[PDB]
Amino acid sequence: PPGPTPFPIIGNILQIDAKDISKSLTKFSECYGPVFTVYLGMKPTVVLHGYEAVKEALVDLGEEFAGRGSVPILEKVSKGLGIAFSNAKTWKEMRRFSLMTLRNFGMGKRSIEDRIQEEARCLVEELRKTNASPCDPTFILGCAPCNVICSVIFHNRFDYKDEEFLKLMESLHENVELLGTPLDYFPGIHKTLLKNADYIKNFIMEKVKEHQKLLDVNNPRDFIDCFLIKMEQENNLEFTLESLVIAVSDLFGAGTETTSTTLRYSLLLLLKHPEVAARVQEEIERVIGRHRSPCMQDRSRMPYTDAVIHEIQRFIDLLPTNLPHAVTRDVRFRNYFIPKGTDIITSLTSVLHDEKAFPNPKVFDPGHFLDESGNFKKSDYFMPFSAGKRMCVGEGLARMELFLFLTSILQNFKLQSLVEPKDLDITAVVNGFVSVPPSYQLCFIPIHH
Ligand code: HEM
Ligand SMILES: [Sm+3]
């Protein structure tokens, strides 16, 4: 028997879930407990809520709870290959290969950090071209992250004004947005995807082809180059010109959106609480010049700044319910039993906002990550990157982008709102998975002695 449940109806249990599913998955947990199941239609999907329930599942029964379960995305000659979504047959392989080559130095001498650093300069510059006038960071803030992945996968980066680039983005974004929350053709919704999916798929392949005309003696300089030089276990293996693309897509897609909506969310919080921004800057001037740009090395000597970036991820809870998971056979979780194929969804919000781990969890306070003896890190219910064997793949470089980008914008800029802090909304709306911040405008005022 599966975990208890909010009694279905026939063709649904959507009976009681809002536009904040995580808000009611917790109403449910308040009864059925840490493990209950609901019916997102006709199929059962058990929910893991306590922190213990989540770690235990995701960490302890690792291979047991390592699935997903979905279909659309695999529509236009889109085989179930790639990194996010799909069968271990291509997962385990395309994942492994991804985790390794996406290591800071998994692509020759030009580390991913150097790459994050280059974009960071470009970000600060173009933020400058803002001439200190009101502005909506939503654009440029999504530019930096798209280019970082552009940089670690093609080796090139694009101009924030470059048509083809803006087009690449137009696509990645519409698709993710037209795909929300965990014979239904509306269906204009479907032809657009195909369109967009197609543009992405091309853009990528165009680079894959030109990337073929030039590589080295194990001197690959980026993802593609690394993949390409994978003619092992005969000509192709799992490596295949099409499986490739699907990965570069999931990397772009998952990699571009999340990071951007966080940087955009970070500034709002710093505008919302400028004392934090001031102390981050104290810390910046104090350990990093006013001159040189930041490098990852600095982070270890900057507890407060790190406490903040940490607190921002915990507080914004970008993915209340992360990506859908699905067990791979049978599993007797606690006194229960879940059958092969069941959909699992883990309430990360529930861990990220645990009140014993992070006192007033609903309060933005870098304190949640500092010790009452000078600033100094801490942490453990810190699972915004999930925690399974399906944990984020970009985690590493994502953590950099945040620290490097953020830190460098605050090194070079004073952030001024257009409305008293006691008057701007920082409440999230939840576009499906992702929690997106409100809309705000701001001026990036240059600093210089
Ligand atoms: C603000 C930064 C980021 C956050 C909070 C974040 C978080 C997550 C979460 C919660 C998941 C799915 C949860 C699960 O299935 O267990 C995920 C999946 C993944 N992420 Fe991100 N991520 C971030 C950045 C990135 C970046 C920059 C990349 C790409 C270079 C990346 C690529 C992926 C991919 C490919 C997956 C699917 C992994 C799999 O199925 O095994 N992420 N991420
Ligand atoms: Sm469009």
Swiss-Prot record:
UniProt cross-references to Pfam families, sorted A to Z: p450
Protein name, per record: Cytochrome P450 2C5
Entry similarity comment: Belongs to the cytochrome P450 family.
UniProt keyword terms in alphabetical order: Endoplasmic reticulum, Heme, Iron, Membrane, Metal-binding, Microsome, Monooxygenase, Oxidoreductase
Major enzyme class: oxidoreductase
Cofactor(s) needed: heme
Species for this entry: Oryctolagus cuniculus
Alphabetized InterPro entries for the sequence: Cyt_P450, Cyt_P450_CS, Cyt_P450_E_grp-I, Cyt_P450_sf, Cytochrome_P450_fam2
SUPFAM superfamilies: Cytochrome P450
Gene Ontology annotations of biological process type: organic acid metabolic process; xenobiotic metabolic process
GO cellular component: endoplasmic reticulum membrane
Other remarks on this protein: This protein differs from other forms of cytochrome P450 in that it catalyzes the 21-hydroxylation of progesterone, resulting in the formation of deoxycorticosterone.
